[PDB]
Amino acid sequence: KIFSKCELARKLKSMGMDGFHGYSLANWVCMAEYESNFNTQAFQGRQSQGSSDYGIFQLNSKWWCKSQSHSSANACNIMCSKFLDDNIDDDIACAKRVVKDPQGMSAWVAWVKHCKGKDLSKYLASCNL
Numbered sequence: 001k002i003f004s005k006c007e008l009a010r011k012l013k014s015m016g017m018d019g020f021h022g023y024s025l026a027n028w029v030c031m032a033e034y035e036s037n038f039n040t041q042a043f044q045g046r047q048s049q050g051s052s053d054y055g056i057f058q059l060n061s062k063w064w065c066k067s068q069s070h071s072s073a074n075a076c077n078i079m080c081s082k083f084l085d086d087n088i089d090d091d092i093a094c095a096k097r098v099v100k101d102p103q104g105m106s107a108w109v110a111w112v113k114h115c116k117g118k119d120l121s122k123y124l125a126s127c128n129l
Contacts (some may be wrong), residue, residue: 001086002037003056005029006127013129015092022097025129026120027111028095032056034110042093055083057095058108064094 002081003011009029012018018025035058036042045121050070061067065080072080076094083091098107106112 003032003039005033005038006124006129008032008038009124009127010129011088012092015089016095017092020096021104022038023105024120026123027105027115030115030118030123031108031111031122031129034114035108040088040091041084043084052080054080055085056080056088057083057091057093057098058110059083059091059094059098064098 006067009025012028012084013025017023017028020111022030032038036056040054040056042055042058044058046052047059050067051060052070053060054065059076059080061070061072061080063073064076065072065078065083066072068081076097078090078094083094085091099105106116
């Protein structure tokens with residue numbers, strides 16, 4: 001499933017993301033756009049050792065969820081496979097956990113290179129929330 005900007009913006013407001021750990025809804029949505037183009041099935045196999053990135057938040061297995069051959073630290077306490085799913089609920093709860101670390105939202109690269117430096121005050125403007 002691919003979400004639209006506003007669709008997602010609505011979803012996240014719903015699940016308590018507006019201002020969650022100092023980050024505005026704009027922020028979260030932008031991370032998403034830049035990380036997966038809003039694709040719940042987005043996946044990226046990293047050529048490192050056993051870390052791949054999952055779902056709309058491109059959630060890494062080295063840290064965050066379990067893989068297969070590839071064991072994890074499993075911060076989020078979930079099977080990484082749970083993220084390649086149409087339902088964004090655990091994807092989000094994992095996302096809220098990621099944010100807690102020192103790096104916060106910079107855990108997410110696309111976010112850093114595409115959104116951190118941007119003025120996102122108009123980002124959501126077209127959205128009925």
